[PDB]
Structure 1
């Protein structure tokens, strides 16, 4: 024993226990989801209202990369911010050299390789976040989810954090019931519902819903936050479904 005290040490299993411990920090965090729709992606997140003293709509969690990529994460919030900062540097250098904005699979590997690099040395700690991200590129819509190990895959629906099992079950129904696909405006409504349903795991404190979306038709393939009437319409839909 002692194999779990240092990052980048293989255990006799062939496991990096420090990475598996980072996953526990992710499992401890709030619920965040991603839904791939017909011509884009939708991101949503649970924000726990610790106190009445929190200013509503101000502590924004979802982050934009370039103009076309949305990023949301569960776990250690600062680690997520550090990863997005790097993602922004990677997207900038890609655009600087190649002119075109970074494709989503290309962007996914940039984050992937960077996160994976933090499992190679004992002088660094793994990332304490799972990151759900994606957007619209020349080849269409893409949704990804990235783990502390550097592992990532493409997704139809993705979920992470404390309410992930609840969310995953709800996403799996949507995939089965909509093989031809889901519209962007539908995906916003469904995202609100899934966060509300996943809130049963964090049911002690009340919460604040935050949604964003990239869609070819609804946002011109740019990342935007869902605000005002469209947000309230999604909250009303979510509130109706739980009752």
Structure 2
């Protein structure tokens, strides 16, 4: 440690006169640096994750550019923000899930994983040597007694369970659209969940999508393993939506 900067704004362990930490808020602002948006919707018997896919160069290999990861055999993920921080947090989550399984003899639940990640992330807020990671994590999975589950955690260390959440630049508009849809009706099948998840992003960004511009991952009760849809299936869903 080389000391702590002086000011109500330049360090993590210094309270403002009004009683608020500003480095945490700046870490929150750091999420919008990527420029992408993510939407997660929970159905009657399924959970769906949809996100953008931007490939600017032509010499890039599009196979190696992705934002959907896999924690365990039955837990998915999607990250928004700084790429390196997202990957580091993914590795930490994998290690924590493996340790829980070894110690307790059965698979870790989604809420337990989210709580563990949030508890680890809170410690960086109360010490002068470490800094928060600029990313947010959304997990999906299926419980035994309960159905699908959607969870989200933020750099401040706060986590909650939702019915339909979003993150990124267009979070507010996505939240309003999802609120209207859920208030209207919630009983959805597998086809309806994917359709509404795609429609939210389409109508918020005002873009007619293409099969190679999005990536989708689903979890269903019949097949509880995380699965990433292919270009043909994405195109079929898009054609059905257009018709």
Query: What TM-score bracket applies, with the shorter chain setting the length?
Result: 0.7 to 0.9
Aligned residue pair count: 233
SS in 2 for 1:50: coil
Query: Counterparts of 1:54 and 1:151 in 2: how far apart (Å)?
Result: 36
C-alpha deviation, 1:57, in angstroms: 4.7
Correspondent of 2:30 among 8, 25, 35 = 25
The RMSD of aligned alpha carbons is 2.1
Contact 1:70 1:135 (8 Å CA) reproduced: yes
Give the deviation of 1:10 after TM superposition. 2.1
Task: Measure the CA separation in 2 of the matches of 1:132 and 1:214.
Answer: 14
Check whether the contact 1:33–1:132 (CA below 8 A) recurs between aligned residues: no
Which of 156, 161, 164 does residue 157 from structure 1 map onto? Answer: 164
1:35 aligns with 2:41: yes
Give the equivalent residue in structure 2 for 1:94: 100
Q: CA deviation at 1:215?
A: 1.3
Q: Give, in angstroms, the shift of residue 231 of structure 1.
A: 1.2
The one-character-per-residue Cα deviations of 1:52-84 (angstroms, maximum 9, x if unpaired) are 333345412111111111111211121111111
**Post-superposition CA distance 1:19-62 (Å, at most 9, x none):** 10011111333101111111231111112232333334541211
What residue in structure 1 maps to residue 16 of structure 2? 11
Instruction: Say if 2:230 is the partner of 1:227.
Output: yes
For the 8 Å contact 1:212–1:224, the answer to whether it is kept is: yes
Could you tell me the TM-score, scaled by structure 1's length? 0.87
Which deviates more from structure 2 when the two are superposed, residues 6-15 or residues 156-165?
Answer: 6-15
Residue 3 of structure 2 corresponds to none
Which residue matches 1:147? 154
The residue correspondences of 1:1-243 to structure 2 (distance < 5 A) are 2-29=7-34, 30-138=36-144, 139-179=146-186, 181-200=187-206, 208-217=213-222, 220-237=223-240, 240=242
What CA deviation, in whole Å up to 9, does each residue of 1:127-166 have, x standing for no partner?
1012221211223211011111011110111111112122
CA distance in 2, matches of 1:52, 1:58: 13
2 CA distance for matches of 1:54 and 1:234? 27
> In structure 1, what is the Cα distance between the partners aligned to 2:8 and 2:239?
50
Greater shift in the superposed pair: 222-231 or 155-164: 222-231
Contact 2:32 2:81 in 1 (8 A): yes
1:102: how far off?
0.6
- Distance in 2, matches of 1:35 and 1:143, equals 8
5+ unaligned residues in a row in structure 1: which ranges? none
Which stretch shifts more, 50-59 or 120-129?
50-59
| Structure of higher CA gyration radius | 2
Distance 2:125 2:182 in 1: 33
**With structure 2 as the length reference, what TM-score do the two structures score?**
0.87
